[PDB]
Amino acid sequence: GLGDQVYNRLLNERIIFLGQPVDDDIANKITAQLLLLASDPEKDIYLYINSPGGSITAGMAIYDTMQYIKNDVVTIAMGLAAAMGQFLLSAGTPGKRFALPNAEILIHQPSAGLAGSASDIKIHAERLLHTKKRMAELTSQHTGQTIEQITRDSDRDRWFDAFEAKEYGLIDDVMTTA
């Protein structure tokens, strides 16, 4: 009950958390909180992403909700922002994306699994290629790097500290006693 109570007060203070792997349930949760907070168009929402990624569709839902509510979304990284959580980190409005000094960030290409007949395998493979291209171009759009730079940096894996991410363009600035 304590966790629910503190989350009650934080939601009353316009604070949202994503401290777990992303799936459909937490996607609905975040969308519901954002829609409820969208009733106030002049205020902003603070977001506290620290998750080891999750599902593609849930992340797309949250990203579209962020771009829909028209409100300013302040996104903060605290612990590990990896895979899809990193994409949600950069999804915030420009100039309001931050990472804590000891926060650590990850980028890598999507992974999935396929099974079925040959035609189904081909269809799923081409959809996987298409969504990989969409992720690459969205990342290159949000961060001031070209598509080729991202698609070669996200070939296998890459890590970032606070200042390396700041200079790379993933975030805008780091907080310290702010």
Partner 1 sequence: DPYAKLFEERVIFLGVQIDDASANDVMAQLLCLESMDPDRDISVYINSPGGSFTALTAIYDTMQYVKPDVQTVCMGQAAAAAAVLLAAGTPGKRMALPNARVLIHQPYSETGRGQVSDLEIAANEILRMRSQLEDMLAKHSTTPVEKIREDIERDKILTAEDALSYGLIDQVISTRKMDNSSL
User: Under the rule (CB under 8 A), what is the footprint of partner 1?
Assistant: 108-119, 121-122, 124-125, 128-129, 132, 155
Count of beta carbons in the 10 Å neighbourhood of residue 121: 12
Among partner 1, a copy of itself, none, what does residue 112 contact (CB within 5–8 Å per kind)? partner 1
Residues in 99-128 that interact with a copy of itself by CB under 8 A: 100-104, 119-120, 123-124, 127
Dihedral sign for Cα 93, 95, 100, 103, please: positive
Residues in 32-71 that interact with a copy of itself by CB under 8 A: 32-33, 35-36, 38, 48, 50-51, 57-58, 60-65, 67-70
Q: How far apart are CA 98 and CA 95, in angstroms?
A: 9
For 61, the token pair is 């839902």
Phi-psi region of 3 (alpha: psi -120 to 50; beta: other; left: phi over 0): alpha
Q: How far apart are CA 175 and CA 97, in angstroms?
A: 10
Least CB distance to a copy of itself at residue 143 (A)? 17
Q: Which residues, in sequence order, are bridge partners of residue 76?
A: 98
Q: Which residues bind a copy of itself (CB under 8 A)?
A: 1-11, 13, 15, 17, 19-20, 24-25, 27-29, 31-33, 35-36, 38, 48, 50-51, 57-58, 60-65, 67-70, 78-80, 100-104, 119-120, 123-124, 127, 130-131, 134, 138, 156-159, 161, 175-178
